[PDB]
Design an enzyme around this catalytic site. Structure first.
Site, PDB file in Angstrom:
ATOM      1  N   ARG A 281       0.880  -1.153   0.000  1.00 23.94           N
ATOM      2  CA  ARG A 281       0.000   0.000   0.000  1.00 23.94           C
ATOM      3  C   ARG A 281       0.919   1.204   0.000  1.00 23.94           C
ATOM      4  NH1 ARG A 281      -1.969  -3.799   3.337  1.00 23.94           N
ATOM      5  NH2 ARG A 281      -4.105  -4.531   3.005  1.00 23.94           N
TER       6      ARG A 281
ATOM      7  N   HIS B 232      -4.111   2.821  -4.863  1.00 23.91           N
ATOM      8  CA  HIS B 232      -4.362   1.399  -4.994  1.00 23.91           C
ATOM      9  C   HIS B 232      -4.213   0.768  -6.372  1.00 23.91           C
ATOM     10  CE1 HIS B 232      -5.226   0.359  -0.903  1.00 23.91           C
ATOM     11  NE2 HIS B 232      -5.852  -0.751  -1.244  1.00 23.91           N
TER      12      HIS B 232
ATOM     13  N   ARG C  57      -1.758  -1.975  -6.983  1.00 27.12           N
ATOM     14  CA  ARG C  57      -2.213  -3.076  -6.143  1.00 27.12           C
ATOM     15  C   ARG C  57      -3.300  -3.830  -6.893  1.00 27.12           C
ATOM     16  NH1 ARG C  57      -1.915  -5.174  -1.293  1.00 27.12           N
ATOM     17  NH2 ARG C  57      -3.818  -5.447  -0.083  1.00 27.12           N
TER      18      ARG C  57
ATOM     19  N   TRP D 217      -3.098 -11.067   1.695  1.00 28.48           N
ATOM     20  CA  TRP D 217      -4.448 -11.339   2.127  1.00 28.48           C
ATOM     21  C   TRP D 217      -4.545 -12.688   2.783  1.00 28.48           C
ATOM     22  CZ3 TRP D 217      -4.025  -9.886  -3.262  1.00 28.48           C
ATOM     23  CH2 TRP D 217      -4.335  -8.547  -3.497  1.00 28.48           C
TER      24      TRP D 217
ATOM     25  N   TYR E  86     -11.165  -7.865  -5.206  1.00 30.40           N
ATOM     26  CA  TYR E  86     -10.218  -7.084  -6.123  1.00 30.40           C
ATOM     27  C   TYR E  86     -10.316  -7.477  -7.637  1.00 30.40           C
ATOM     28  CZ  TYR E  86      -7.198  -4.502  -2.387  1.00 30.40           C
ATOM     29  OH  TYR E  86      -6.721  -3.693  -1.362  1.00 30.40           O
TER      30      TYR E  86
END
Ligand SMILES: [Mg+2]
Ligand SMILES: [Mg+2]
Ligand SMILES: [Mg+2]
Ligand SMILES: [Mg+2]
Ligand SMILES: [Mg+2]
Ligand SMILES: [Mg+2]
Ligand SMILES: [Mg+2]
Lengths: 322, 321, 322, 332
Positions: free
Chosen positions: A154, A270, A273, A296, A305
Site C-alpha cells: 500500500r 491502490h 495493487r 491477504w 479485487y
DNA sequence: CGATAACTCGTATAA
DNA sequence: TGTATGCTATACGAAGTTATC
DNA sequence: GGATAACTTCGTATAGCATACATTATACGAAGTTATC
DNA sequence: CGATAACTCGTATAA
DNA sequence: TGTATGCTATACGAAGTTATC
DNA sequence: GGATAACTTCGTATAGCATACATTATACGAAGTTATC
C-alpha cells in the site's frame, strides 16, 4: 456513571493503541453526530436507539455513499462498546434501518467503486517512456512505480521503507522488509522481493539521490524544482505525495482528467495493487500464490479485487470463439 | 408487552429483507401456527419443548434437512426481532437438530444440483433452431446464448434492458449490468456476449422490435401467433425463462418420468453449471472461473466440477504414475 | 438436583445426536469410575476435584496410557457440563494433575504408537499374488485393500458404501460417494475417485458377487465357507471384519503375529491411511493436495500422520551422500 | 522458591489453590518455573523500589510496570513474557488476571505498536549450512586431539539430524544401533511430546558415521551401554564417560561458538545476539539446504519435527526459490 | 450330529 | 481430528567448580 | 599453594513452539452365532 | 522581491 | 480487511389469464 | 361459442451464497509552507 467515565478516560490516555486514522474518523463522525444532534434538540451521548436511526436516514437523504453511512454508525458503535454501554446497533431499530439503507441504495443503481487499474501493460509503457531520463524527479518515480507494482504494497507501507530494511537474495534480487501494514503489526515482519528489473530501478535511484548515506534514512524523499534529492530520516514522504506520483504519470501519458468530479479518473494509490492483482488471476496463478503477493488471508478478499478483462475480455468469450 | 413494539418496528422497516424472505417467513409462520392449533400449543412465543416436537414432525412428513433448517431458521428471526429468546438458543432444539441431521444424512438423504447445460448442448440446440423464422424460436436461442455466455442468473437476465446494451469496436455486445444485487459486486459491472451470441441476440432485437424504447426489457412475451409484445413495465417472468430451458430439453429427449425427482431437465442454473464445467475442462484457473461466474466461496464451484478427470485426485495420479 | 435430572434426561433423550461409540465409551467410564468409587467410599456424582484426582492418579498406577486416562477425564467432564455443572477439569487440581500425569509419562519414555504402514509397495505385492486367484473371497479382499489404500477412507466409512453410491467419470473411473465420516456430516458430501487399475478390481467383485442386483446393497459383504457371496441392505460387513482382512493379508506374507502382546504387529484399519499419506509425502505432493486426499483440514494433522523413511532414510541422508 | 505470598496479603483460598499448584508442580516444565520465578522476582523488586503492593497486583501498577520495561529497552516478546507469567500467577491462584482489564490490555497493545514502528525486529539463529560443515570438516578431520574428534562428531550429528541440542546431550550409546548399509541409526527415546512429530529414530549418513565412530573409539564410551554418547574432556585431552551426568546444553552451545571462533575469529565488539553459530544454527542451516535442493515442505518439516510451516518458512524466506509470483511474471 | 469357515462385547488407545 | 494464546526452549555473559598444568 | 583448561550453574532476555476442549474413531482377544462340510 | 516547483487538513468512501 | 449462518434466490406442480386459433 | 398457446401468479420445498463486527486505510480538492528560479 462512574464506570463509563473511567472506561472512556482509560481510552484517551492510551489513544495511541488505535490507529491515528481511527481517531481522525472517530472525532469526525463524532462532531458530525453532535452537530445534527443539537440542531434537532436531542442528547448525543449515550445515544438513544431511535435518535441514531433518524440520523442514519438524514445521511441517506444527504445523498451519502452507503459505506459512509456505515462508518458513521460504526464509529458511534465503538464509542459506546468501548465505554461499556450497549451500542446503537444493539437495537432492532438501528440494526434494521441500516440494512434497509444498504438495500434501497443498492437498487437505485449504486455499487462500490475501485481504483483505476495500473497493469503490466502500463508499467512497460511508463518505464520505456521515462526509462532513459536523467532527472532525479523521474528516476525516482519510475522506481516508486516498479515497487508499487511488484510488491503490491500500500502507499503508506511504502512511504515507510528505510534503507536498513533492504537486503539482497543470493541471486541478486532485492528484498524489502516490511514491519507494520494495514492488518499485521509484528516483529517477525515479512519480506517482499523486487525483481531484477525493478531492483535496478531502485539501485539507480539510490545513488542518484544518495540516501544510502545514513541507513536510518527513508528510501524515498522530496526532489525540489532545482533537481536535488533532499534525503531525511525523520520525515517521510506523505502518502498524499505518492498518490500524486500516480495522478501525474497518467496526466503525462493521457493528460488532463475530466470535469466530471467523479472518483478514480486517473491512477491513484491502490492502482498498482489492484493492477497486479488482475494480471495475476489473468495469468492463471493459484489462489494461495495471489494471497501472498497481496498479503491477504482469504479468498473472500482476493476475490473481491477482481472485476477483470473487458474488450474481447477473456474466459468464456475466449472459449466460445473456437 | 414490549415485544409488540419491537414487532411494529420490525415492520416499520420491512424493507430490510427480500420480498423473497418475507414469503418464507410467512409461509413458515403459517405452517408452525397450523400445527400449533391441532396439537394444543401457543404458536407465539415459541416454547422449545414445542418447536422440538414440531421439528421432529417435519422429519416424519419427509421434508429434507435443508428445509427443516429454513423452518427453524425463520422461526428464530421472528423471535430475535422482538427482544425475545430464539428457540435455537434452547438446549432441546439444537439437541434434536443434530439428531435429525445425522439421522437423515445417515438414512441416505442427498443434496442435488442442476442438470448441466454444457457447450455440447448449446451447439446441438443452435443447429435445430438456428435457421428457424418463428418470432419465438429466435428469442429462445438468444436467451440461451446469453445464459451460457454470461453465467448471469435467470433473474438478472430478465431485468436487462436495451439501454444496458451497447457495443465494443471488436463487434461484440456488452450488456451493462446496472442494478447489481450486492454492494460489492464480485461479478463484473459489464458482461460481454461473444461474437456469435451477439449476432444471435441482434436477430431477436429487430424481429421483436424491443429496440424502439430503450427502457423496454430486452426479452418479452410472445403470443400464439409469432409476434413480440414489447413493454417496459412488466419483465419476462422468472418462471417464464425457466420454462424456456424446460422446453428445449423436452424437444430433444422427450418428456419427464412419472417420478417427482427435481432436475430431470435443464432449469435456470443449468447454464452456469455447464459454463463452469467447460472452463474447467479447458484449463481455466479456479480464480478466473470463480470470477466469470461471480462466485465467492470456492466449494460451490468445486461442487460442480467434482467429477471431471482432471479433478480426480493425487492418489490416482500416483497409481497411474 | 431437580434441573440436572432434566438436562441429563434431555441428553439421554436425543442420545442419537451423539455417535454410537461416544455413548458406548461414556458409560464404560462411569462404570470404571463408579467401581473405584464404591470400593473407596467416595460419592460418584457430582464428582469432587480431589476424588477425580485421586482416581486419575490411580489409573496412572494401574499402568494406563496417557491418551487413555485423558479419555476417562474427558467423559467425566462431558457428563458434568452436559448436565449443567462445573467440570471437574475446571478445578485447579484436576487439571494440574492431568498435565502432570502426561509430562511424567512422556518424560519417562511413553510415546503414541501408530498403525503399521501399508505403502504402495505393499499393494503391488499383495496384488501379484492374488491377482490371478478365482476364489470368491480373494477377489473381495483385494478390492477392499485397493479401495482402502487408494481412497484413504476409514474402514467404518468403507463398510457403509452402497452400490447406488458409485458413479463414473467419462474417462471411466469409479467414483465412490461418501457422506458421513468422523469429521463431518452433511448432504453435500465428498466424492473419492478410484484409479483405473483399481476401479477394475471393483468392477470385478461387483460381478462375481453380484451385490449389484439391488441398489441399496452394501458394496462389501460376507463370504461363507463355500465361496458364495451374500448381499444385504440391512447389515453392513463388520468393521471388526475389515480389520481382519488386513491381518490376514499380512499373515499371507509375513507368517504369524509374534507373541509380545504389543499392538500394531501387522496391518490393521489405518494401515492404508498412514501408508498412502507417507507415499504421497515422499513422492513430493503438496500440503493442500495431501490434505484433500485424506479429508483433513489442517497442516497439523497431515504432519501428524508422518514418521517417515527408516534406515538409509531420505532427505539429509540423500543430501549428504550425493 | 516464590517471593513472599504475605501473612495478611495472600488472603483466603488463593492460599488453597497456590498450595495445589505447588503440590502438582511437576505439571510445568523445569524451564517454566525458572521464568515464573524470575519474573515474580523481577516484578517484586520494581515494586519494592517503587513502593507498590506486589500481590495480588493492581492494574494501574502492572501498567506503570510494563511501560517501565519498555523504557529499559526490552523487546516485545520479552514484555509479553513478563505479562504472561504474572497472568498465570494470578489465574492459577484464583484471582482475576491483569490484561483482563482495559488499562493493561490497552497499554500492551500500544507498547506493541510503538515498538514496531521504532523498527524493532526479531533476530533468528545464524545458519550453519552444509558448506560450513564441509569447511569445518576439512580442517579438523586431521586433528587427533580428542577434543576435536568429539566436537566434529557433534557438529556432524547436529546438522545431519536436525535434533535440538538438549535432545543430543541425552543420546546414550545403548541407543546407537546399525543399519544393513553400515550407517549408524540413533533411536531417540525420551522424546519431547506424547506424539513425537519428528520420529523415533534418526539415521546418520555414511560419512557422519565415520565421524562418530572415531569419537566412540577414542573416548571409550562403549565400556558401559548406559553411558551418554558425549562427555567432557579435560586439560589433558582425556575422555571421561558417565551415565549419570550429561554434557550441558551450555557446552554444546560452546562447541558451536568455538568452532566459529576458529574459522572466523574473535567475536565482534557490540553485544548483538547471533554473531556466531549457536544451538539452532544447524536446524536453520539444514532447513535451507533442503529447500535449495528441491524438497517438499512436508518432507522438510518432518525432517525437523516442525509442524507449523509458519516456521520453516521464516528460515527459507530469503531463498530465491521463494521470491514469489509477481517476480515470475515480471521476468518473462 | 458335531466340527468348522467366516464372521458382538468390553476395555484400551488413537485420531 | 478441529478450534482456541500460553507454556517451554535456547542465548549468553558471568560466576562458581574441579582436576591438571 | 596458584594459574588455568573446560566445564557447570545462574539469571535474565527472547525465540520457538505445544496442548485443552469435546467428542468420535480404531485395536484386539474372547465369547457368541449362522450356515457349510 | 515576486512567481513557481514540489510538497496539512476535513470530509467522503474503500478495504 | 475474514466467515460461521442467516438471509436470498431458484424449482416446480398447478391454478388463474388473456389474446389468438 | 369452445379449445388452446403462452404466459402470469401462488405456495411450499431446496439450493445458493454474503454479512454484521471493528477497526484501518486511501480519495482528493483547498489551503498552507519553503527552498529556488
Ligand atoms: Mg456496521
Ligand atoms: Mg532458565
Ligand atoms: Mg554461507
Ligand atoms: Mg570446546
Ligand atoms: Mg560468518
Ligand atoms: Mg576459562
Ligand atoms: Mg463522513
Amino acid at each position: 456513571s462512574d464506570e463509563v467515565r473511567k472506561n472512556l478516560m482509560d481510552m484517551f490516555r492510551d489513544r495511541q493503541a488505535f490507529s491515528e486514522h481511527t481517531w481522525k474518523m472517530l472525532l469526525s463522525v463524532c462532531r458530525s453526530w453532535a452537530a445534527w444532534c443539537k440542531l434537532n434538540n436531542r442528547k448525543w451521548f449515550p445515544a438513544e436507539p431511535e435518535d441514531v436511526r433518524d440520523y442514519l436516514l438524514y445521511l441517506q437523504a444527504r445523498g451519502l455513499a452507503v459505506k459512509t453511512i456505515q462508518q458513521h454508525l460504526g464509529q458511534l458503535n465503538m464509542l459506546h462498546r468501548r465505554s461499556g454501554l450497549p451500542r446503537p446497533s444493539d437495537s432492532n431499530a438501528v440494526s434494521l434501518v441500516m440494512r434497509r439503507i444498504r438495500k434501497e441504495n443498492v437498487d437505485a443503481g449504486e455499487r462500490a467503486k475501485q481504483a483505476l487499474a495500473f497493469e503490466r501493460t502500463d508499467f512497460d509503457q511508463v518505464r520505456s517512456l521515462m526509462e532513459n531520463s536523467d532527472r532525479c524527479q523521474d528516476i525516482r518515480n519510475l522506481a516508486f512505480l516498479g515497487i508499487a507494482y511488484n510488491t503490491l504494497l500500500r502507499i503508506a507501507e511504502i512511504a515507510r521503507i528505510r534503507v536498513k530494511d533492504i537486503s539482497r537474495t543470493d541471486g541478486g534480487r532485492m528484498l524489502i522488509h516490511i514491519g507494520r501494514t494495514k492488518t499485521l503489526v509484528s516483529t517477525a515482519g515479512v519480506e517482499k522481493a523486487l525483481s531484477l528489473g525493478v531492483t535496478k530501478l531502485v539501485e539507480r535511484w539510490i545513488s542518484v539521490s544518495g540516501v544510502a548515506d545514513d541507513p536510518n534514512n527513508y528510501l524515498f524523499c522530496r526532489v525540489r524544482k532545482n533537481g536535488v534529492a533532499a534525503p531525511s530520516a525523520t520525515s517521510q514522504l506523505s502518502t498524499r505525495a505518492l498518490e500524486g506520483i500516480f495522478e501525474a504519470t497518467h496526466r503525462l501519458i493521457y493528460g488532463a482528467k475530466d470535469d466530471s468530479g467523479q472518483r478514480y479518473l486517473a491512477w491513484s494509490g491502490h492502482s498498482a495493487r489492484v493492477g497486479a492483482a488482475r494480471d495475476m488471476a489473468r495469468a492463471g496463478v493459484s489462489i494461495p500464490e495471489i494471497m501472498q503477493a497481496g498479503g491477504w488471508t482469504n479468498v473472500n478478499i482476493v476475490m473481491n479485487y477482481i472485476r477483470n478483462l473487458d474488450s474481447e475480455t477473456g474466459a468464456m468469450v475466449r472459449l466460445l470463439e473456437d
